[PDB]
Design a protein around this ligand. Sequence first.
Ligand SMILES: [Cl-]
Ligand SMILES: [Cl-]
Ligand SMILES: [Cl-]
Ligand SMILES: [Cl-]
Ligand SMILES: [Zn+2]
Ligand SMILES: [Zn+2]
Ligand SMILES: [Zn+2]
Ligand SMILES: [Zn+2]
Ligand SMILES: [Zn+2]
Ligand SMILES: [Zn+2]
Ligand SMILES: [Zn+2]
Ligand SMILES: [Zn+2]
Ligand SMILES: [Zn+2]
Ligand SMILES: [Zn+2]
Ligand SMILES: [Zn+2]
Ligand SMILES: [Zn+2]
Ligand SMILES: [Zn+2]
Ligand SMILES: [Zn+2]
Ligand SMILES: [Zn+2]
Ligand SMILES: [Zn+2]
Ligand SMILES: [Zn+2]
Ligand SMILES: [Zn+2]
Ligand SMILES: [Zn+2]
Ligand SMILES: [Zn+2]
Lengths: 316, 316
Amino acid sequence: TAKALRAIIDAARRTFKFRMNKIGEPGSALLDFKDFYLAITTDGVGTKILVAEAVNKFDTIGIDMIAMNVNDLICVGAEPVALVDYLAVKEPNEDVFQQIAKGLYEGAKEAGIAIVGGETAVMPDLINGYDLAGTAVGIVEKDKVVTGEKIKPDDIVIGISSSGIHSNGLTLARKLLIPKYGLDYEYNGKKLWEWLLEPTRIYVKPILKLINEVEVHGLAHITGGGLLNLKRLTKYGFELEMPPIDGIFKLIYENGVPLEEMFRVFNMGVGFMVIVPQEEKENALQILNKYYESFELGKVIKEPEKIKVKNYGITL
Amino acid sequence: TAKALRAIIDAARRTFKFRMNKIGEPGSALLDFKDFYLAITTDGVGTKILVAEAVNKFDTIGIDMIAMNVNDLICVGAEPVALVDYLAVKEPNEDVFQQIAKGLYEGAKEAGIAIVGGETAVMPDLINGYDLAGTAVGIVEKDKVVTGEKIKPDDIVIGISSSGIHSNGLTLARKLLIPKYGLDYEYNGKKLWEWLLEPTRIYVKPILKLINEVEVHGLAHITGGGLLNLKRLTKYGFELEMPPIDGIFKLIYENGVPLEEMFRVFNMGVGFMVIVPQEEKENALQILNKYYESFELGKVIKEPEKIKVKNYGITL
Ligand SMILES: [Cl-]
Ligand SMILES: [Cl-]
Ligand SMILES: [Cl-]
Ligand SMILES: [Cl-]
Ligand SMILES: [Zn+2]
Ligand SMILES: [Zn+2]
Ligand SMILES: [Zn+2]
Ligand SMILES: [Zn+2]
Ligand SMILES: [Zn+2]
Ligand SMILES: [Zn+2]
Ligand SMILES: [Zn+2]
Ligand SMILES: [Zn+2]
Ligand SMILES: [Zn+2]
Ligand SMILES: [Zn+2]
Ligand SMILES: [Zn+2]
Ligand SMILES: [Zn+2]
Ligand SMILES: [Zn+2]
Ligand SMILES: [Zn+2]
Ligand SMILES: [Zn+2]
Ligand SMILES: [Zn+2]
Ligand SMILES: [Zn+2]
Ligand SMILES: [Zn+2]
Ligand SMILES: [Zn+2]
Ligand SMILES: [Zn+2]
């Protein structure tokens, strides 16, 4: 898969010269609009829509699509503004479309954005079900971009607790759990399809409020890659105490996926991470906990690169 | 299909209040960024990709995707800036991806834009081939939006000649012509799959040059809807002399599709239309003909709404 994709990525990178010394030049991708940067991001829901089809429950899949886009905008400090959607279907089912629209409205409400357009394509010779994707745009001032460059040792890492499972980990979870257990298996009070369909969490409001009130050095959406999303932020290392394995991640880990790979695939209870100075710890926790449960995770340390999960004995 | 889609469109319109008195408020969709409007548009290639799969020729389908997006941006006078793509595949074929990338590069070159991101989703339980879509953003100053409000009677309509077929008409053309004739049928020097796969034309450069040099009252991308795209521009009517039926449109019209519906579905030889004052006619034709063959079509007339195609005896 990776080999084929490099062709598209390499071709797109050659088009950057077409905006040289022009408005909107690229430099989330960040577009130079002189007065600000325009952040742009693109993501689909993936195979989580297969669980939605299996149980005829589509009213939260639009929350997932919006969440994957707007959470990647706030990574760089951008305020999400608008989103356009791409919906490709085999057949136009009125009742499914009304379900999808409810999740799109609620997701746009939490993210504080407007859904300003999109395309619905009925292609039964092409799609065998439902495919939902989207593109989001945000705005960030040029001196407010959160790059992670200001992350220094002794900075504190704070995690905001997650909700649902992302697309990459959901492929492994479906493939590992559905044949053995079935979608109707009850695990720890929730049926398996509920664990797999539960929408991911939208972090726009607590993060925008945090950035407005607190000195922030780093922002990481814990999506595909797990703690690897934290590693790309800085050349320094981390020393974390991740929360106990719990929920659906306990069942997956019980079913043979090694610890080292769990933290590289799933969010493991933390959906978003912030990095503030030592002194801002209590300010930051107090703001974020108005919204979701947030908690101290670890610190930035001097030994470069590696992430050391103390209470597990894992290194990434 | 229409009934189901209204649910998504009505839900998206309710989210507009979420940007009230905020940056990027909606008002192509146009986003109020104070210093300018950001135009945003979304479109996929549709079933033209089925012809590409049938003949293993994917090196122009990316031209189509970019053309459908950037031609809808310049409709309002916006300069296209960037594009992100959504590619959903059954299998990641390296050779097909290298083909697609060539068309994306060449299309971005003609449109003068950068491809700044996107998502490729390998979902074999979801796609049975290839699905290519995209979103484009452009910029237009607030006092430069071409709305069509300045269109008045005696204004001259100029058409820029088209290239290929759009997605809506391609569905009718495949369905009408492929069973009777086969993709290998030679019609007027080109095989049928070549008529159906030929990319649509990118009009960014001649239109941007026109808007910079000439007083322009109206801009219409002749896409899905045919001459109906001209009708939405103004409450006044039109009196046109469309070019003779020719090329693949001759074979379709020979195969039973009525004249009135041809001008409502296909581009009929004109891919883009501009409306300038009477006095600008020769200035405008001289600029556009540096790029593609452009020609006088008709005029705006006083009798409201209806489009009268003189040399056919059709009214729309
Ligand atoms: Cl997400
Ligand atoms: Cl996850
Ligand atoms: Cl087009
Ligand atoms: Cl057409
Ligand atoms: Zn530059
Ligand atoms: Zn994704
Ligand atoms: Zn993402
Ligand atoms: Zn009904
Ligand atoms: Zn400043
Ligand atoms: Zn600082
Ligand atoms: Zn997430
Ligand atoms: Zn101090
Ligand atoms: Zn402080
Ligand atoms: Zn205190
Ligand atoms: Zn307003
Ligand atoms: Zn379309
Ligand atoms: Zn279009
Ligand atoms: Zn190879
Ligand atoms: Zn001005
Ligand atoms: Zn004028
Ligand atoms: Zn076109
Ligand atoms: Zn004069
Ligand atoms: Zn003049
Ligand atoms: Zn002259």
